[PDB]
Design a protein around this nucleic acid. Structure first.
Ligand code: NA
Ligand SMILES: [Zn+2]
Ligand SMILES: [Zn+2]
Ligand SMILES: [Zn+2]
Ligand SMILES: [Zn+2]
Ligand SMILES: [Zn+2]
Ligand SMILES: [Zn+2]
Ligand SMILES: [Zn+2]
Ligand SMILES: [Zn+2]
Ligand SMILES: [Zn+2]
Length: 260
DNA sequence: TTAGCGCCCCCTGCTGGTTAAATGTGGTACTGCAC
DNA sequence: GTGCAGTACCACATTTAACCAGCAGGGGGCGCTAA
């Protein structure tokens, strides 16, 4: 009937030894047995054996099915879920099941809640929900590169990926390709190739039904659709007021605006 | 009494598969101008 | 009007990194009994 009770708090214990351990755990905060490697100490001998095992790497119990030996029996019991499945914990909202309690708690925090505090990157403006995801973001974007990484479009060298990407975003309104015979410039290589074809007079695309050649693919396509396709009729736009037909809509719109 | 043991949890952190935002590609209309 | 020459949409395919559940390591609390 739990005759022994702790006067310092609400806990009541059966035996004297249990109550003494409880006082040491939560009321005296003194640990007699101390780790020899560091300042860590343990009230219970098993806890100190835990730290000594971590200090030395001793793995007592081996998994039956795999190549993992745990240093604590509970770690092996948790590792056995890898083979059995057996997701014990269940979310109370979406009823999803998880192999670990911390996995379920993180799921509830990040999937079923709105005003959750997030982590801000100390080096950039991004805001990340998880600390582990922030560490991944730091370890890739803000990681230092000893050999550097050249810009894709200029001779600038950067050692942080975030800096390189920010610099490369400044070239998105730029016409890298420049013709060697005039001042014309463009952003895609195909346009530069077309312009050099016009400069040289080359007409690579040739009509297979006539003697006419063209410097661009679309010009040949429209020529074939006009003078080699009887079923094609040019789009005619009649004026809104006068009704005069215009092949180009822009001329029709301008005429309608100036029409009386 | 006291250590061994079992259970159970919390806290922290890394990791690949998923996915959504960002960005590059290319087909195809689409206008300005000289004829 | 038209063909040439250059520009402009934009659906689509990569590219990229946050999202997220699956994992393991380090520690703390108690409730049993045997020894
Ligand atoms: Na262009
Ligand atoms: Zn107490
Ligand atoms: Zn230690
Ligand atoms: Zn195993
Ligand atoms: Zn849920
Ligand atoms: Zn950042
Ligand atoms: Zn650059
Ligand atoms: Zn040129
Ligand atoms: Zn033809
Ligand atoms: Zn008119």
């Amino acid at each position: 009937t739990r005759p022994h009770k702790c006067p310092d708090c609400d806990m009541a214990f059966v035996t004297s030894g249990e109550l003494v351990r409880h006082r040491r755990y939560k009321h005296t905060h003194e640990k007699p047995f101390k780790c020899s490697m560091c300042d860590y100490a343990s009230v219970e001998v098993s806890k100190l054996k835990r730290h000594i095992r971590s200090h030395t790497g001793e793995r007592p119990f081996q998994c039956s099915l795999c190549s993992y030996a745990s240093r604590d029996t509970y770690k092996l019991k948790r590792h056995m879920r890898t083979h059995s499945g057996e997701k014990p914990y269940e979310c109370y909202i979406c009823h999803a099941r998880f192999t670990q309690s911390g996995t379920m708690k993180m799921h509830i925090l990040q999937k079923h809640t709105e005003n959750v505090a997030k982590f801000h990157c100390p080096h950039c403006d991004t805001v990340i929900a998880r600390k582990s995801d922030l560490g991944v973001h730091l370890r890739k974007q803000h990681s230092y590169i000893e050999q550097g990484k050249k810009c894709r479009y200029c001779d600038a060298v950067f050692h942080e990926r975030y800096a390189l990407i920010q610099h490369q975003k400044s070239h998105k309104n730029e016409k890298r390709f420049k013709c060697d015979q005039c001042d014309y410039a463009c952003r895609q290589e195909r346009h530069m190739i077309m312009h050099k074809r016009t400069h040289t007079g080359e007409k690579p695309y040739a009509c297979s039904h006539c003697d006419k050649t063209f410097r661009q693919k679309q010009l040949l396509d429209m020529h074939f659709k006009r003078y080699h396709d009887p079923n094609f009729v040019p789009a005619a736009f009649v004026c809104s007021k006068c009704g005069k037909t215009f092949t180009r809509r822009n001329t029709m719109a301008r005429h309608a605006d100036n029409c009386a």
